Enzyme design. Structure first.
Site, short mmCIF file in Angstrom:
data_model
loop_
_atom_site.label_atom_id
_atom_site.label_comp_id
_atom_site.label_asym_id
_atom_site.label_seq_id
_atom_site.Cartn_x
_atom_site.Cartn_y
_atom_site.Cartn_z
N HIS A 164 -19.60 15.13 30.42
CA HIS A 164 -18.10 15.05 30.91
C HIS A 164 -17.88 15.68 31.97
O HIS A 164 -18.31 16.79 32.30
CB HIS A 164 -17.00 15.50 29.69
CG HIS A 164 -17.07 14.85 28.36
ND1 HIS A 164 -18.36 15.14 27.49
CD2 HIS A 164 -16.58 13.91 27.91
CE1 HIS A 164 -18.23 14.53 26.56
NE2 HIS A 164 -17.24 13.77 26.56
N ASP B 279 -17.37 19.32 31.65
CA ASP B 279 -18.36 20.04 30.83
C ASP B 279 -19.41 20.65 32.13
O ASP B 279 -19.86 21.76 32.16
CB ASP B 279 -19.60 19.16 30.48
CG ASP B 279 -19.28 18.62 29.26
OD1 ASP B 279 -18.28 19.00 28.42
OD2 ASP B 279 -19.47 17.25 28.77
N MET C 298 -25.55 8.54 32.93
CA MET C 298 -24.48 8.50 32.28
C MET C 298 -23.56 9.49 32.44
O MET C 298 -24.15 10.76 32.47
CB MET C 298 -24.67 7.89 30.85
CG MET C 298 -23.41 7.48 30.15
SD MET C 298 -22.23 8.98 29.53
CE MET C 298 -23.29 9.17 27.91
N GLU D 294 -16.82 3.26 24.04
CA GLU D 294 -17.46 4.13 22.67
C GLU D 294 -16.39 3.93 21.77
O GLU D 294 -15.35 4.56 21.73
CB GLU D 294 -17.84 5.46 22.97
CG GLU D 294 -18.10 6.06 21.84
CD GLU D 294 -19.14 7.39 22.15
OE1 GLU D 294 -19.19 7.69 23.35
OE2 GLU D 294 -19.38 8.37 21.37
N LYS E 294 -14.54 4.36 17.93
CA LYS E 294 -14.50 5.45 16.82
C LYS E 294 -13.58 5.03 16.03
O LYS E 294 -12.32 4.74 16.47
CB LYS E 294 -14.47 6.63 17.46
CG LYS E 294 -14.89 7.86 16.17
CD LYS E 294 -14.77 9.31 16.76
CE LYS E 294 -15.05 10.13 15.54
NZ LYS E 294 -14.65 11.61 15.87
N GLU F 46 -21.87 4.43 18.42
CA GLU F 46 -22.28 5.60 18.17
C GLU F 46 -22.58 5.41 16.54
O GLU F 46 -21.75 5.15 15.86
CB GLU F 46 -21.59 6.83 18.37
CG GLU F 46 -22.22 8.24 17.71
CD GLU F 46 -20.98 9.48 18.02
OE1 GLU F 46 -20.85 9.66 19.18
OE2 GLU F 46 -20.92 10.12 17.00
N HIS G 213 -20.29 6.89 14.15
CA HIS G 213 -19.04 6.17 14.20
C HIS G 213 -18.83 4.93 13.51
O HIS G 213 -17.80 4.89 12.79
CB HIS G 213 -18.45 6.14 15.72
CG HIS G 213 -18.28 7.35 16.38
ND1 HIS G 213 -18.02 7.55 17.82
CD2 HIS G 213 -18.49 8.50 16.02
CE1 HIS G 213 -18.11 8.83 18.11
NE2 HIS G 213 -18.49 9.51 17.14
N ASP H 109 -25.48 5.85 21.64
CA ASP H 109 -25.14 7.34 21.08
C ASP H 109 -26.07 7.46 19.70
O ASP H 109 -25.76 6.76 18.61
CB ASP H 109 -24.09 7.92 20.76
CG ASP H 109 -23.25 8.26 22.16
OD1 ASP H 109 -23.88 8.01 23.28
OD2 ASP H 109 -21.98 8.90 22.36
N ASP I 110 -16.54 13.26 11.64
CA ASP I 110 -17.92 13.03 12.46
C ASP I 110 -18.63 14.19 12.40
O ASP I 110 -18.47 15.31 12.92
CB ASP I 110 -17.01 12.71 13.82
CG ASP I 110 -18.23 12.33 14.75
OD1 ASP I 110 -19.11 11.61 14.58
OD2 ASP I 110 -17.78 12.65 16.20
N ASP J 239 -21.99 14.39 13.51
CA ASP J 239 -22.92 14.45 14.89
C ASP J 239 -24.17 15.33 14.19
O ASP J 239 -24.75 15.96 15.02
CB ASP J 239 -22.29 15.11 15.78
CG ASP J 239 -21.27 14.18 16.56
OD1 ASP J 239 -20.90 13.06 16.27
OD2 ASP J 239 -20.86 14.63 17.95
N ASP K 79 -25.99 11.97 21.12
CA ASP K 79 -24.65 12.69 20.97
C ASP K 79 -24.46 13.33 19.56
O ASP K 79 -24.34 12.72 18.51
CB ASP K 79 -23.49 11.41 21.14
CG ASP K 79 -22.19 12.40 21.08
OD1 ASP K 79 -22.05 13.73 21.13
OD2 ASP K 79 -21.01 11.77 21.38
MN LIG Z 1 -20.57 9.61 21.24
MN LIG Z 2 -19.56 11.41 16.83
#
Ligand SMILES: [Mn+2]
Ligand SMILES: [Mn+2]
Ligand SMILES: [Mg+2]
Ligand SMILES: [Mg+2]
Ligand SMILES: [Mg+2]
Ligand SMILES: [Mg+2]
Ligand SMILES: [Mn+2]
Ligand SMILES: [Mn+2]
Ligand SMILES: [Mn+2]
Ligand SMILES: [Mn+2]
Ligand SMILES: [Mn+2]
Ligand SMILES: [Mn+2]
Ligand code: NA
Ligand code: NA
Ligand code: NA
Ligand code: NA
Ligand code: NA
Ligand code: NA
Ligand code: NA
Ligand code: NA
Lengths: 387, 387, 387, 387
Positions: free
Chosen positions: A53, A56, A87, A180, A182, A216, A219, A244, A254, A256, A286
């Site tokens: 991002h 980041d 990406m 993406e 979710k 993802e 998700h 992802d 979530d 992850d 991710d």
């Molecule tokens: Mn993601």
């Molecule tokens: Mn996630």
């Protein structure tokens, strides 16, 4: 064994291994990582690239000189390691200004700012060589029914994506967008909650060819859906621009988890599908090393993502190559599923007594599908227990 | 109070009030109803019409003379009551021949038979005046990953729907199709599991204008999704051709509770949306009186479906008409959500310092959304507790 | 490889392999099996025994002479094969009389009949050598809030189980009871919905030592719970009298997939726990071969239940025996978890400055748990990918 | 209308209205509140009292003089307003030292520190007049199967609670403990995940009378369970020492919506149960004003919690007092459910031909339960739509 290679195209977000461990109930457990550190450590594990991002890589609110220095250091790390940046994405969710959304905030001034923030980062993504620009609209949605008129919000979401498409076209950029989905979290319900909803939305954009999905694993599983099935629909539509990879234990927040954790058999069927279909994009993770871990555990968790993909790839390939499995697939009529129902055409079907008056429904119904033997061959291959 | 009228357009499947009460663990608790009985009793409650699967009206395997007599008796009941038949559908799920699917069965002979069974019933639906032909592919899917190649199954599903579109076009029929998603049950995972997936699929059909969705309250809730949001996306796409109304308590087996039961606030927001949008289709109930009930309880449950819709309609209308609510909607910037983000165009947005360099993000972030006061006005209106 | 043996104690309900395939939407796909057939076929696969509901063995409403003949034929099959009958149960859910419950039906006459039906079958279970009598109260519960006063229903449930305990005590029987929780289905909500609720209820019975739990993998997973954790609590309480093994994909209708299907990693951790704890009871499968299958698929699915248990047993044993895993367990302080917190006693803890004033919270917080490396060793062992 | 009074006993955690809005993806949207501000504002809304974690009232790491000043200011606010402090709790979840747990951390030194931190705050709770001390073990659990031996963790959890019971007994305190279950979040799975598991655990403590449950609406709903049913079991056990009221939309992350939001009909049945049973404890709200809100929205959301309780109380009382409802309850045999099944005793039941040989199962099965009419009366009462 199970050593990553460049052709594997394994990539990681800076925010994954860089997650400091703050959760809804707990403070950070790890210090912040310099992106340069993450690039070098991931390269040592055999990763191909990273993703980011905007915020980041460049602290929010940085001056132009600060922005240049952050990018320069990052590019040196990429050059020092051979790592790529396939990406990038915008953070339209952390800052309080985005509490009701970016592109679909009720406040028009926020929607305009969100677009300008994204456009600035598209330019940077292109400079770094990214092929895909992801959008995860984590703040687009509502906790209550009156707060968000969804038809109006979809109009605003289409307007935003159409403007971004106009932008990249006008600049001659080759980058494409990947939405993406979710279903919820951090909003009570998020707009475009599944792969299906995102695919449907894309069809109504002005330049649909510029947009695909970034599904993802976790998700789709937060809605209890079958992730391999959703990926199959995205592939069928020609829209799997990025993916992802992670793990999730069902209908929860979530998690992850590292890839392979969570629903292991769904991970197997996912890898089987991606490899069989010849998916050529990044295998992007991710994920979040749990906050219980120190930095050695961070790197172990990242290595595990790649290792599990490679084990599953081996097992799925062995499944598909096994003559006993090929025989079982024919016994279950997977070959017939791939043949047209009525290439003879509608009139021939209407005239075909074997399709109606002379169809022996009870004889057909008596035929077993033999799906359980096929699935136990799949289990035996996954577990390396053939015999 | 809360008396149904013809303009309400309340309709019921024969299989709803006619459900005999067999469940995964239990035998029937009620005798079978003659469709004539159901038509007359529903008319007495103020319903507008009924709907049917082929095999609800004509026992499977009936001779031509038996088929004619069943239809004749049904039409007399419709004529005796003024009841309409706005929708019909095919049973492609009960008979053992359909255990792996109809349109996406692995066996090609079954796929062809499924099409012929559907086509025969489309003709009957048109003869009875139906405007919509529903398809709920409850057997399309899998319990295991190797059993169903989803890309191939989607090819077969598209082929089937394209053939049906060719059929109705060739016969000059005005009927249109409505695909009913469901995420699971009776298959472990069902193809086209949500409104989004069905909307996306439709866009790839040869004649997309002939197809829409028939979303069911409880089915979207079996994936934990927001049913009003999904209906909003269907309306945004111009694809809400029909709807199935019922209740569901979250992520469980398909309960088919009477409308208003289950998630009551979602029922409120649904009715608000349908009425605000001017949805003109049937208000169709796909529900099951619980097997605890005798026939008096069957009719009480059906009456309750309509009563709850009418109570919610009153409360939602009062909410929208209340000047205090209108003020709260403006305080929450719902008016701004409905305005374009950038009707000035991309270049003007890029040149607008108020959208970036001069945007005061902290002042914007300080503004409260006032969504909680708005939602408590909504609660007060739903409960009739204003004051 | 992975051949069942008698010491494995694998057992199956007659209703598992005998399930004819009727589901909420579909007719039977397989003919009924004679229990004698099932006993002989299961024995050929290496099963140890079978279990039954009363009405699986003796058709409901049978005369005394019919009952004797059904039992005689069954006992001959057991004698011909060496198969045992370690558990039996009552069907208090299929017949319409039980639509609101057996032991907690609102109608008192039904509650009394349910008890008499159970008592008759306890006598038969003892005659066949069963050590455990299961009770799955699938009809105990409600679809609506006013229908069932749960405090009163718990009083009736306690009264029923207390009477059954008085009965077995009075007859000098050694059999014990095992209550099987389920959260929902076929009732909207079922009483005693989880292992925890059943354990808590048992503590309030008059003779608590006579009662334990019969947890089922898929039932706890229908509430999204961790089945190994629940089994650990049952073992901790001394109450794991029996277990039902199968697979489930999360929060859905009760799928009853073969064991190892569904959540494969939870199956691994379950087997690890049962074997580590020395669970000595039957490894009983309560599963349903999918209705897609013919009888060859029925027997393949049953064989797969046992095969998957044995593969997982091998892998879990190898995990626990691996010196690298033992080192990782110590690195993660699993040894410390097993030591008392304060065997020195309360006053010593209160006086211990190392537990408060001199506890270096930041040094403690810096220590990583190393759980990710441990879990990747577990994954490698499960997949047979060590190296 | 619907004005809170002191006898309503509405209480709020400092951390509820004081939640600054940080979520897994977003920074704080509101400044920190001084507890004095919250006490005064809540009193102005008609609240009865507040509750606190240690670290809500006294910043972690405060010196003794700082601790005294924070408590002095808080007590002045309580004295200035008449607000009470009926409950307190320990924060054993935010600080990184607790990342693997407090009482069940694998590290013994952390377990000892957690106990000392709790004991210090029990003393303060008693000084402030609290009757109940809550424990929510949000960090007790795991993300992976090898990380936590649940039998050992339950041994440590019992040891901890037994030491706390010894402590309060030794000091002559009248306070009692209330364990708050949650199924997951922030750990992948939390130990004691439901009301049932916590009730069962309590029965194994050395002084079980000192411990009860603090169930939270949304936590049971995160497992898809029926919260009123769980409260009924806690009341049946005599263990409902405290309750946390809020709203939740099903199987998601813990939303902590205001009470009445989420599952509105479950809120109705909860209030009906608490009032019918004569629950005498605090009506405590553990909720979070959404981060979209400014401080005016915080106070509106808190006021809404109390308002919704009072509306539901009125409607439930009207339901129970309505002679038509009383008649419907008798028609549905709720009166019979409350009568013993067999007060005549086991031998009389065994000898009663009306319970077996002469029981007309088909006549019994034909009787309808009339539950749908009863539930529609309940709906009409909730909505104020009687007529
Ligand atoms: Mn993601
Ligand atoms: Mn996630
Ligand atoms: Mg192919
Ligand atoms: Mg408008
Ligand atoms: Mg040990
Ligand atoms: Mg009473
Ligand atoms: Mn349904
Ligand atoms: Mn339907
Ligand atoms: Mn089951
Ligand atoms: Mn079972
Ligand atoms: Mn909570
Ligand atoms: Mn709480
Ligand atoms: Na608009
Ligand atoms: Na693609
Ligand atoms: Na194909
Ligand atoms: Na529409
Ligand atoms: Na009672
Ligand atoms: Na045990
Ligand atoms: Na221990
Ligand atoms: Na109590």
């Amino acid at each position: 064994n199970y050593a990553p290679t460049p052709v594997d195209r394994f990539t990681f977000g800076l925010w994954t291994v860089g997650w400091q461990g703050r959760d809804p109930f707990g403070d950070a457990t790890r210090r912040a990582l310099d992106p340069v550190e993450s690039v070098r450590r991931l390269a040592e594990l055999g990763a191909h690239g990273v993703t980011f991002h905007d915020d980041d890589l460049i602290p929010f609110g940085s001056s132009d000189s600060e922005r240049e220095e952050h990018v320069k250091r990052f590019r040196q790390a990429l050059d020092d390691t051979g790592m790529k940046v396939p990406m990038a994405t915008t953070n339209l969710f952390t800052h309080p200004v985005f509490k009701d959304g970016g592109f679909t905030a009720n406040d028009r001034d926020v929607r305009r700012y969100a677009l300008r923030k994204t456009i600035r980062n598209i330019d940077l993504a292109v400079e770094l060589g990214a092929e895909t620009y992801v959008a995860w609209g984590g703040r687009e949605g509502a906790e209550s029914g009156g707060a968000k008129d969804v038809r109006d919000a979809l109009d605003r979401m289409k307007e935003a994506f159409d403007l971004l498409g106009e932008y990249v076209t006008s600049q001659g950029y080759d980058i494409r967008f990947a939405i993406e989905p979710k279903p919820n979290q951090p909003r009570g319900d998020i707009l475009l909650p599944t792969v299906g909803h995102a695919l449907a939305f894309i069809e109504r954009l002005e330049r649909p060819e510029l947009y695909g999905v970034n599904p993802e694993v976790g998700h789709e599983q937060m809605a209890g859906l079958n992730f391999p099935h959703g990926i199959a629909q995205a592939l069928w539509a020609g829209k799997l621009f990025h993916i992802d990879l992670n793990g999730q234990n069902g209908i929860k927040y979530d998690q992850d988890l590292r890839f392979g954790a969570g629903d292991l058999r769904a991970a197997f069927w996912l890898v089987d599908l991606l490899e069989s279909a010849g998916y050529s994009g990044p295998r992007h993770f991710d994920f979040k090393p749990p906050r219980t871990e120190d930095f050695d555990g961070v790197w172990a968790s990242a290595a595990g993502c790649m290792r599990n993909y490679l084990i599953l790839k081996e097992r799925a390939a062995a499944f598909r190559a096994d003559p006993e499995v090929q025989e079982a697939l024919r016994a279950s009529r997977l070959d017939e599923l791939a043949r047209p129902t009525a290439a003879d055409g509608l009139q021939a079907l209407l005239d075909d007594r074997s399709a109606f008056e002379e169809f022996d429904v009870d004889a057909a119904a008596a035929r077993g599908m033999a799906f359980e033997r096929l699935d136990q061959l799949a289990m035996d291959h996954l577990l390396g227990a053939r015999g």
